[PDB]
Structure formats: C-alpha cells, structure tokens
RNA sequence: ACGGCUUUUCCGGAGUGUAAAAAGCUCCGGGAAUAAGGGCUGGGCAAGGCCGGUGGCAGCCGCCGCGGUAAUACCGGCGGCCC
RNA sequence: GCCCGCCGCCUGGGGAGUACGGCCGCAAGGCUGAAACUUAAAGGAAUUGGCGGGGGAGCACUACAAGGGGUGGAGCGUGCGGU
C-alpha cells in the first residue's frame, strides 16, 4: 500500500545472489546488484518475481540499492488496476 | 616438506595428502611461469 | 568460653555412643583432644569433636570456602547435585577440611560441617624467620610443601606482623588454624578451588613429617596443638 | 630428555648464546626488536590524529548480535591514508557532516586493536571541529558555523 | 529550626620585605560570609530486584556477554558506591 | 622415580611449510624459511547420556509369521484443506 517516497521506485527481482544479495530490475531500465536490510530480512521471504521498493545507495546510485518494501497479491492487483504501473513491467 | 602431524586430524578439513597434492600442483605453475 | 562448657556439658549426657572410641570418651578415661591422635584410632562420631572442642561450632570457626552445582544427564532432562567445601577450627592449633553433596544447599551444608570435624588433623608453629627471631607460634616453624591435582603449595616463615600472604582460600585455611604470618609461592592451577584447599592442607600436615632435635624446639619456639600460654 | 644443559662451571658462553638463540621464538620481543608495528602503523606512533571525513557507512554486526554500528571514512592528514573510524554514542551520527574534520585515536581492545563486535574497526572518534562529541552527544554544547 | 563562637581562606588599611616592585610574614576593621567535581552502579569488583521511555530497532560491551513489548546490563529520573 | 653430564628442539590457533633469496638434483623433488592480515579459542585425558546400515538378552496382533473380514474404484452422510 505505501508508495515511493523520493529517489525510491518499484522494481522487479530477478535472481537471488546469496547472503541477503538480489538482482532487481528497476522502472529506469537498469539491474542493480540490491542488498536487502536485515530487520525485514528476517520475517519476511522474498522469492524472485515480486515488485518491490528500492532505494539506490547515495554513492554510485546506477548499480545498488536496498530494498525496503514488498508488494503483496492484493497491492499489486490494486495498482495494476489503478494504472500507476503496467503489466509488462511485472512480466518483462 | 616439513611435517605438522597436526595436520594429519580429520576434525574440520580435507585430508593432508590431497592438500598436498594441491599445493604442488600450483608450485609447478608458478615455476614455469617463471622461466619464460 | 563459658557457653561452650555447659554446650560440651549438654551434649554428654544425651549421647548414645556406638564405638569405641566413643564409649571410652563418654565414660571419662579421655579427656584431652590431643589424646585421640598418635595411636591409630578410627573416628567416626562427629559428637567426639563437639565434646572434646566445643569451639568448632562457633560461627567465627568455620568456614564455607565454595559452592558449586554440577549436572548430570539423563533422557529426561539434567539433574542438578551441589557441591559444597568448607573448613573448621580452633583458631588455636586444630584443623579440618571436608567436602558434603545434596541435593539442596542446606543438606549439602550440613553434610560438609559435618566431614570437617572427622577430618581434624593438629599442626605445629613457630617463628623460623632469618628476619625474625622471636620463638613465638605466629608463623610456621621452617619450609613446607604440599601439592594436589595440578597444585603446588610452598609455605615459607615471615616476620611477625607480616600478614598472610597468600590467595584467599588460604588466608581463611591458615586463619583457622591459629597462624598470622606467612610467606608462599604456588605453581599449577589456582582457580581450581578444590585442589588449592587440598594442597595448603597437605602442607600444613606435613610440618609433622619434619625430623627435629630438642635444641631446634628451643630455638624456634615450637608449639604443639594448644599455644597453653 | 636428560638434565637441563649446560650446567658446568666454565661454559658461560654456550649459555648465553642458548638463552639469545631461543628469544627469538617469543612473538612480544620479535616484534619491539625488529619495530614491526611502527613499519605498519598508519598512525606513525602517535596516540590521537587528525583527517577529514570522506563518507559516511554502516557496518553489521558480528553473529549473533543483530544491528548497524555507524562509522565514517577518514583520510588522514599526516601521511594521506584511508581509515574507518567508529562514532560512539546515541544518534552521534547527526552531528558529523561530509568535509569535517576529526581527531580519531584507539578503539581499546585486545593488543591495541578491534574490540566486541565490530572486528575491522580499530578507531573511534573525539572531537568534530574543536568541540567534544561527548558534549553534543549528551548537549551543554551546539556544533558551531553551523 | 533556634542561640552562640572563630576568621586559615576572602574585602579594605599600617609595618617589614625587595636593586625597585610583587608575593610572603606581624598587626588592625568587616563578616559564615567568598569556594565540589569526575567516574561507576549484571559478574570480575565496592554499590538498586525501584520508577518512566525503546522493543534484535536504537544502543552497550577491555573479557564474559545484554537488548526479540514484563530490560536489576541500553536512554532518563530518584537513590547508592569509590576516590 | 631421586641424582651427576653433553647435544638437539618448542613458546596460542591460522596465513604456512607458503612468498622472496641461496645451496643441492638429469628430472621429479630435498634442505633452509618470513611478513601484512585474521581469530578466542584450537588441543589433551577422563564422565553421564543419546545414537550406530556394532554385539548379546528380552518383548508387542496400534509388529511379523499362520489365518478371518476389509479400506483404496461408484453414489451419498459427515469432518478438514483450498477457493
Ligand atoms: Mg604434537
Ligand atoms: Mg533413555
Ligand atoms: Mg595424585
Ligand atoms: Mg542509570
Ligand atoms: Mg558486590
Ligand atoms: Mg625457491
Ligand atoms: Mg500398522
Ligand atoms: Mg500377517
Ligand atoms: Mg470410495
Ligand atoms: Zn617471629
């Protein structure tokens, strides 16, 4: 439900790295190697192809980034129907 | 080589011999890298 | 003092003796508490002690020197035993180390009060000091040594006025004991409670172990059980 | 093994040389004789330095405690190095901006080195532009030129 | 809280001191007046089983270890300990 | 074990028996041998349990063997997951 707040925007995962590391493919066209904080680390289980929040790091903001939000069923649904983001952003 | 029969407990590594066998393998590398 | 002799008195009436070294001291034929060493006795009645020296119930005479609790496992879970060490004395010539389990504290208190007294040994003391001459039975008498597990004890005669320097298990053991100044040097494992109090033990027994000659119990003021100003 | 050697009246000399030769086997004295710590030491020797922050980071801790330690790149004045430098306190972070200049010592630990769980850092900080960092941290004091 | 006392120290003077000064020292007048901080508080290691905030976050931690909504260990109040 | 001699070797775990230099060997290799950095244990002997595709002794139709009757396929009663 929260939105992009700033520099932040969606982003969609696409291969785990391992130890916390995803590679997401952002709303600008461009794959950021992402680290994922260890307090939602912990509770929360993402799987590749989930739309996500990403905040790029403040030094060389073009390849990291943190994620910091995940979009449930029913948000994504919700915005797909609200017309803030496309359908083939989510499928590629 | 110099013995460490230290080296010789399986507890928590690979066996000794195959260490061995390892490290001379990458000496001969750096040997004939060397002369050219 | 007083108190003690209508304790001892109290204790001698309403006691059933059941060998016989107790039997010959409910009867009257040993009055003495250094009658009962030097002869090979077995001493199995902790009401011996409380009749002959009735001081060793004194609070200020004893001791609890440590208080483990150690587990052990079953399939159902750990089960917990305490472990208890403590020591007895007269604070005038008389000794005794003892070690109790249980179940709780209190019973394994009890337990280790009670194997001090069987344990009591007698000491000797003097002044063997190159830097104190005196003859008087503050310090010991010459150079010991006692050892236990990885423990070594050496015990050396200090001036008068010294101190006792040593660790605290030994301060309380030699403090009992009725001795006020010492010298020591130790090798081992200190912090193993246990074998420490064991080795300082050991080496005051041995004081007995030392050949000597009368001119040397002149010289050095040797005192034998009670200083009996 | 036999008895400790040698034992005689006349050979000092081997004893002396017995005693040199296994010295060098102790780390502590190696280490002062050859001055190994000050052919590495970024610090030069000296207790306190001075640089300027770089940027600011953020570290993990060390399993299994949870949590981000702050700390700051500085480079040093004295001979142009890089260090990291951890910021103690309660929100002591706020009061560090890039291009400040910082005093930075030791961190306090085993062998003058890292202590709990940051291993990697070796220095903390004191003072940010002449004024305490305990002070801010606790007030009784504001940051000046702003 | 009442009643009394003293003036090292503090304020204003005379002498002595000093190459000249300043300190110091002996007297005189006024008056309890002019004067306490720093660290620690789970064990090592002396000292709280109290209250309010925060909630694996923020933070502490020489070492061992605390913090996951009922924190004697973090931040603050009130107590207490060492010098 | 108690004593009288001489020589060799060791000084927390790793990096490492490695890098660099030297000598020896046709070659394969041998002898000599650091540091930056990293880490709070690594290592030994013994104890109580639990486990073994280790041994022995015993036991059970919620085990087998010898048997009798079934459930699993259809429609329906009822409980559960999902939607
Ligand atoms: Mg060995
Ligand atoms: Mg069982
Ligand atoms: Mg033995
Ligand atoms: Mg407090
Ligand atoms: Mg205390
Ligand atoms: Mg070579
Ligand atoms: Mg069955
Ligand atoms: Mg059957
Ligand atoms: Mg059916
Ligand atoms: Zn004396």
Request: aromatic letters at 6%; proline letters at 5%; charged letters at 35%.
């Amino acid at each position: 439900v929260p939105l992009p707040e700033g520099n932040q925007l969606f982003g969609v995962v696409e291969q785990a790295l391992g130890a916390g590391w995803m590679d997401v493919r952002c709303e600008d066209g461009k794959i950021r190697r992402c680290r994922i904080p260890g307090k939602l680390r912990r509770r929360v289980w993402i799987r590749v192809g989930d739309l996500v929040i990403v905040q790029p790091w403040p030094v060389q903001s073009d390849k990291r980034g943190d994620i910091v939000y995940r979009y449930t069923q029913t948000q994504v649904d919700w915005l797909l129907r609200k017309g803030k983001i496309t359908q083939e952003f989510l499928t590629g | 080589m110099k013995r460490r029969p230290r080296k010789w407990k399986k507890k928590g590594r690979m066996r000794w011999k195959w260490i061995k066998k390892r490290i001379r393998r990458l000496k001969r590398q750096r040997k004939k890298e060397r002369g050219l | 003092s007083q108190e003690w002799k209508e304790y001892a008195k109290r204790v001698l009436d309403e006691w059933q003796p059941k060998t016989k070294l107790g039997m010959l001291v409910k009867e009257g034929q040993i009055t003495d508490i250094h009658e009962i060493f030097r002869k090979g006795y077995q001493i199995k009645e902790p009401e011996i002690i409380d009749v002959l020296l009735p001081e060793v119930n004194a609070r200020e005479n004893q001791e609890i020197l440590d208080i483990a609790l150690t587990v052990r496992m079953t399939d159902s879970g750990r089960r917990v035993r305490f472990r208890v060490l403590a020591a007895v004395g007269n604070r005038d010539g008389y000794v005794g180390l003892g070690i109790g389990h249980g179940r709780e504290v209190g019973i394994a208190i009890r337990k280790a009060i009670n194997y001090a007294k069987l344990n009591i040994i007698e000491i000797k003391r003097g002044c063997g000091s190159w830097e104190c001459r005196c003859r008087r039975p503050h310090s010991v008498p010459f150079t010991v040594e006692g050892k236990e597990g990885s423990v070594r004890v050496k015990l050396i005669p200090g001036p008068r006025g010294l101190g006792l320097v040593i660790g605290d298990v030994g301060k309380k053991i030699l403090r009992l004991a009725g001795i006020q100044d010492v010298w020591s040097q130790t090798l081992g494992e200190t912090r193993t409670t246990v074998n420490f109090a064991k080795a300082v033990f050991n080496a005051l027994y041995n004081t007995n172990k030392v050949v000597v000659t009368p001119e040397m119990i002149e010289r050095y003021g040797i005192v034998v059980g009670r200083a009996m100003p | 093994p036999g008895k400790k050697a040698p034992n005689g009246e006349f050979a000092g000399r081997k004893l002396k040389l017995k005693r040199k030769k296994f010295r060098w086997s102790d780390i502590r004295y190696k280490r002062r004789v050859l001055r190994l710590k000050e052919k590495s030491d970024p610090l030069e020797g000296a207790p306190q330095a001075r640089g300027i922050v770089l940027e600011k980071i953020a570290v993990e801790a060390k399993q299994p405690n949870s949590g981000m330690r702050k700390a700051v790149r500085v480079q040093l004045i004295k001979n142009g190095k890089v260090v990291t430098a951890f910021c103690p306190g309660d929100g002591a972070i706020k009061f560090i901006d890039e291009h400040d200049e910082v005093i930075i010592e030791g961190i306090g630990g085993p062998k003058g080195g890292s202590m709990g769980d940051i291993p990697g850092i070796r220095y903390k900080v004191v003072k940010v532009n002449r004024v305490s960092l305990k002070e801010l941290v606790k007030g009784r004091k504001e940051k000046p030129r702003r």
